[PDB]
């Protein structure tokens, strides 16, 4: 009877991997970085793109897993590994190395998490300049109707950096951080047709045309 599970809140409020990247133990410049967009993954992108304008808070879950890489030493002992995830809002200083001053995060929020514990989680508010997030943008970045065309003239959400706080281990360890978004308290407007053609690029709608549906033999075929 009830249409409860088909509410927008239930539809979108499930964690989804939006991106995942890797970094190395000592390395040299073994830090990772990610400009935050929601269009690199197909599943979440389609769910969000069923609507033109959205508004919601976010639940961020990080799943960080490491693995031993080959080494030449005798019996390398792994001490527990701690990681730092720093958020650099647009305009802030950017880490250029694993031992940069930016990592001090006096103002920039960041998480310190030790392996073997519950995955770290953070909620974040509605961070938009406008009165709603924009899923599509039929315009340009420059008033001369030139420069960039699409939603990447709007996307400016800052960067996300990843590093080992532990370091110098006698044997190398490679880590993989997986970012997960879960929209909370969602508000959607102007529904639009589901995506039909496979996604091609994260920064534009560009598609390769495909057929409307699967095919059958005859109109009376069953």
């Amino acid at each position: 009877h009830s249409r409860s599970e088909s509410s927008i809140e239930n539809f979108l409020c499930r964690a989804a991997c939006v991106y995942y990247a890797t970094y190395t133990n000592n390395s040299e410049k073994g830090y990772a970085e990610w400009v935050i967009n929601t269009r690199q993954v197909a599943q979440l992108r389609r769910k969000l793109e069923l609507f033109t304008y959205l508004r919601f808070d976010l639940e961020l879950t990080f799943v960080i897993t490491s693995a031993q890489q080959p080494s030449t030493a005798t019996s390398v002992d792994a001490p527990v590994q701690t990681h730092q995830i720093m958020y650099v809002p647009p305009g802030g200083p950017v880490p250029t190395k694993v031992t940069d001053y930016a990592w001090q995060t006096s103002t920039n929020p960041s998480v310190f998490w030790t392996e073997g514990n519950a995955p770290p989680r953070m909620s974040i508010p509605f961070i938009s300049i406008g009165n709603a997030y924009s899923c599509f943008y039929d315009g340009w970045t420059q008033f001369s109707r030139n420069g960039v065309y699409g939603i990447n003239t709007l996307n400016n959400m800052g960067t996300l950096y990843m590093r080992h706080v532990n370091e110098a281990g006698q044997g190398p360890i490679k880590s993989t951080v997986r970012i997960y978004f879960k929209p909370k308290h969602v508000k959607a407007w102007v529904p639009r047709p589901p995506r039909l053609c496979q996604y091609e690029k994260q920064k534009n709608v560009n598609f390769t045309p495909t057929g409307v549906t699967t095919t059958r033999v005859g109109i009376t075929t069953t």
Partner: peptide, 17 residues
């Protein structure tokens, strides 16, 4: 029974009901 522990509304659970 649902009590909110955080000072910021964004920290709350989903509006499931």
């Amino acid at each position: 029974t649902n009590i909110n522990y955080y000072k910021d509304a964004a920290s709350n659970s989903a509006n499931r009901q």
